Design a protein around this ligand. Structure first.
Ligand SMILES: COc1ccc2[nH]cc(CN(C)C)c2c1
Length: 165
């Protein structure tokens, strides 16, 4: 099970960790991907998770998009977790760098409530351009299931913990 996490609330935990390394170690039931609507896993968390699957995530994702079309911003889909988890919950947080409504971050986090326990990154953080402090706040105030947050950057992790109300 999950080790070395700092407990923020009744159900939200946080750790300074590489989500790929964490997923390979824990083999959780669900790992969350910071997906885009096209499931094009090019960079950030998505690029890293996909590279860890030797591109099997991208191949599965392209078939999913060919069949279903793009996801909605704020939406999700469950696909295989490959060598990282039982499942991957691809969740699309708004990309501030694409001018997407930051208000959609709460809708994005609501997808986590369909899973009792998840390993996840902060949605819309990193290359998605949102303030990670705000993302953690929305996470805590939206997710009711058990979420283990992996924050890659130590400096950001320390800032998130030290500023957590
Ligand atoms: C039936 O073959 C394809 C191949 C690629 C595709 N990309 C998107 C679609 C259309 N689908 C969303 C209905 C598609 C179909």
């Amino acid at each position: 099970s999950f080790s070395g996490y700092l407990k923020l609330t009744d159900n939200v935990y946080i750790k300074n960790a590489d989500i790929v390394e964490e997923a390979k170690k824990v083999k959780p039931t669900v790992v969350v991907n910071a997906a885009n609507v096209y499931l094009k896993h090019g960079g950030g968390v998505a690029g890293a998770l996909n590279k860890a699957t030797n591109n099997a995530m991208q191949v599965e994702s392209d078939d999913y998009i060919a069949t279903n079309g793009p996801l909605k911003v704020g939406g999700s889909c469950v696909l295989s977790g490959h060598n990282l988890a039982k499942h991957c919950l691809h969740v699309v947080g708004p990309n501030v760098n694409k001018g997407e409504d930051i208000q959609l971050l709460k809708s994005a986090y609501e997808n986590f409530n369909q899973h009792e326990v998840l390993l996840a990154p902060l949605l819309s953080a990193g290359i998605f351009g949102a303030d990670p402090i705000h993302s953690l706040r929305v996470c805590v105030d939206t997710v009711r299931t058990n979420v283990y947050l992996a924050v890659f950057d130590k400096n950001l992790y320390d800032k998130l913990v030290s500023s957590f109300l």
